[PDB]
């Protein structure tokens, strides 16, 4: 690893110093990692995609919708998470303006194993175009646990642009937790990346309403 | 006889390989149509 | 002239095709069949545009 833990600790220290004390903001500020990869071609090279689950959640309150069956909706009443049924999706009747409104409403979607087949048939491909596609859930697993999991998901997918960005966590967390999460995210990124630590163009740490800080 | 030429030998009189020979071929191989761009009778 | 493997071709034209005129040039490329290849490459570009037009 070219990046060192003490340098991460230092840069996190002035980042939290700027975010917390000097210029506090009313909204909670998310810490962002913005990466750019180097000597890489989206068209020819394999398009890497991967996901990791952070231990402490970056975004506790981000909106999630659960497409679900009878059992999934009844459990979602206990979870307190917004849900529309298969009958509701049939109501929608593949109308583009309303489904675009739903896609801009909800950042994340969780769907059942049974209904994940016809989620494209009822809804179409505009979810894949946006990049928000429903994540599978089963009857055995806990919905609120997987809501916490999806809220803690970090995903790197190549697409077409050679620069990516993820949300490591909040400003308000503790410094060692922030250092550990940014280190494991960089390690996950270089694990997905071929010819690791040399196709890394630039790594940037930032806070929401904050200046950029360059880690190599 | 095949000791005497690349085309020699066989139970029928026939060339075997193609008779068009590369320009980069060596001495003893250049027997035939050397570096032919095309062959055959044009009409 | 700054893409890969072009100066290797440009050496040979200076070597053996310096003293030539366009009538002989057209005759020799027609007799060697490269003109048909150039035509089919531009044709393949034409159906590349045309298939998008038929899709629309």
């Amino acid at each position: 690893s070219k990046i060192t833990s003490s340098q991460v600790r230092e840069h996190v220290k002035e980042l939290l110093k700027y975010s917390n004390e000097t210029k506090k903001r009313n909204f909670l500020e998310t810490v962002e990692l913005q990466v750019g990869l180097k000597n890489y071609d989206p068209q020819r090279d394999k398009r890497f995609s991967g996901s990791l689950k952070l231990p402490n959640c970056p975004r506790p309150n981000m909106s999630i919708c659960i497409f679900g069956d009878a059992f999934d909706v009844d459990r979602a009443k206990s979870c307190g998470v917004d849900a529309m049924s298969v009958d509701d999706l049939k109501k929608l009747n593949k109308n583009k303006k309303l489904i675009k409104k739903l896609s801009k409403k909800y950042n994340a979607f969780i769907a059942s194993e049974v209904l994940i087949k016809q989620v494209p048939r009822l809804l179409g491909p505009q979810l894949s175009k946006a990049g928000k596609f429903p994540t599978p859930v089963s009857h055995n697993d806990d919905l609120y646990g997987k809501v916490t999991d999806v809220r803690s998901t970090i995903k790197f997918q190549l697409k077409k642009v050679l620069c990516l960005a993820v949300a490591v966590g909040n400003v308000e967390m503790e410094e060692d937790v922030l250092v550990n999460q940014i280190l494991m995210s960089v390690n996950f990124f270089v694990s997905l990346l071929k010819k690791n630590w040399q196709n890394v163009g630039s790594l940037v740490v930032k806070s929401s309403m904050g200046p950029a800080f360059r880690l190599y | 006889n095949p000791v005497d030429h690349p085309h020699g030998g066989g139970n029928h009189q026939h060339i075997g390989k193609a008779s068009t020979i590369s320009r980069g071929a060596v001495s003893g191989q250049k027997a035939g149509l050397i570096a032919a761009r095309r062959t055959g009778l044009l009409r | 002239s700054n893409v890969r493997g072009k100066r290797g071709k440009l050496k040979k034209i200076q070597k053996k095709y310096a003293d030539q005129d366009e009538t002989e040039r057209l005759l020799r490329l027609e007799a060697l069949g490269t003109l048909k290849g150039i035509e089919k490459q531009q044709q393949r570009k034409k159906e590349e545009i045309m298939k998008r037009e038929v899709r629309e």
């Binding site: 016809q118 494209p120 894949s128 599978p136 | - | 298939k51």
Partner: protein
């Protein structure tokens, strides 16, 4: 391992072989005795699955030829954008790494996705390179 050895006589028609480090599928096999005393030689004519080229090799029958592992896998389309298919696995896994087909198969698939059928895509893996070969429509579970 990715690939495993086999004997030429053990090979038979509609089977996969490695010819010049390419995954190939045999269309023709022919064995002819070398000399009256000698062993027969196997002449193999095969087609590359990915590129469609015709490759032939002749070998001794007792010789061992390399054979790939070919896996055919079944997926449902999500979107066709920028020449890259997006597929959806059973248990909800999704891949976007597959490039769209470039031939009449790709044209027919593009028209079918434009006019809105639910399309079932067969993609094959052999020796670390990936492609799509055929598509059907789901007769039930609409």
């Amino acid at each position: 391992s990715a690939t495993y050895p086999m004997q030429c006589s053990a090979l038979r028609k509609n089977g996969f072989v490695v010819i010049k480090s390419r995954p190939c599928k045999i269309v023709d096999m022919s064995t002819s005795k070398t000399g009256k005393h000698g062993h027969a030689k196997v002449h193999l004519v095969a087609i590359d699955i990915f590129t469609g080229k015709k490759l032939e090799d002749l070998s001794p029958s007792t010789h061992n030829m390399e054979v790939p592992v070919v896996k055919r896998n079944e997926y449902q389309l999500l979107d066709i954008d920028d020449g890259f298919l997006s597929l959806m696995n059973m248990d909800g896994d999704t891949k976007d790494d597959v490039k769209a087909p470039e031939g009449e198969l790709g044209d027919s698939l593009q028209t079918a996705f434009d006019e809105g059928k639910d399309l079932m895509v067969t993609i094959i893996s052999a020796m670390g390179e990936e492609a799509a070969i055929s598509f059907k429509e789901a007769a039930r579970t609409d």
